Amino acid sequence: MGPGFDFAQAIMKKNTVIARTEKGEFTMLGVYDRVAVIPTHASVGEIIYINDVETRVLDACALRDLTDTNLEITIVKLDRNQKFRDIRHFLPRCEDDYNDAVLSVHTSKFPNMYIPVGQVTNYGFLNLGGTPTHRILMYNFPTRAGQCGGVVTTTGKVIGIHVGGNGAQGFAAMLLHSYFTD
């Protein structure tokens, strides 16, 4: 409907796949080459389904900060025959607050879904399903089951992936440029 939704759509149309693990269907953001991200609670194994095709996982790393605290991001390298558009230049370099964000989801259940979530706070610490978690972004939208892995964008920046909610607020794990230096 406007430039926020335009940037979000551009990312969804080229840089997402539908990932399925034993823990469900997730929006999955491809970042560059065969490297993608998914919430750590997806429990990625040796094999994953990508757009309903059996795909070997070449590597999977559950990120933690240097205090050895969960970040809820898993970086996956996929045995896929095709590279993602490189979107690393849209990643923030530092932790920050944002205005006017969009959460975008694409699953079998929720295709072509875009939510204007508004102002995003650098919330920091969250007890997420019992797990101490750092680098959390918060937005005042009542997000629901099926949105995990959803991409959080502003115009010109890809800032996080949706990892949970409390019924009133939604929470995303930060994406930082430093996670994807090769």
Swiss-Prot record:
Active site: H41, E72, C148
Domain Peptidase C3: 2-180
Subcellular locations according to the entry: Host cytoplasm
Residue ranges the record marks as coiled coil: none
Catalyzed chemical reaction(s): Selective cleavage of Gln-|-Gly bond in the poliovirus polyprotein. In other picornavirus reactions Glu may be substituted for Gln, and Ser or Thr for Gly
Transmembrane segments annotated in the record for this chain: none
Subunit structure: Interacts with host IFIH1/MDA5; this interaction inhibits host IFIH1.
Function summary: Major viral protease that mediates proteolytic processing of the polyprotein. Cleaves host EIF5B, contributing to host translation shutoff. Also cleaves host PABPC1, contributing to host translation shutoff. Binds and inhibits host IFIH1/MDA5, thereby inhibiting the type-I IFN production and the establishment of the antiviral state. Cleaves host MAP3K7/TAK1, resulting in inhibition of TRAF6-triggered NF-kappa-B induction. Cleaves host TICAM1; this interaction allows the virus to disrupt host TLR3 signaling. Cleaves host IRF7, resulting in inhibition of type-I IFN production.
Protein name per UniProt: Protease 3C
Residues of the full protein shown: 1549 to 1729 of 2188
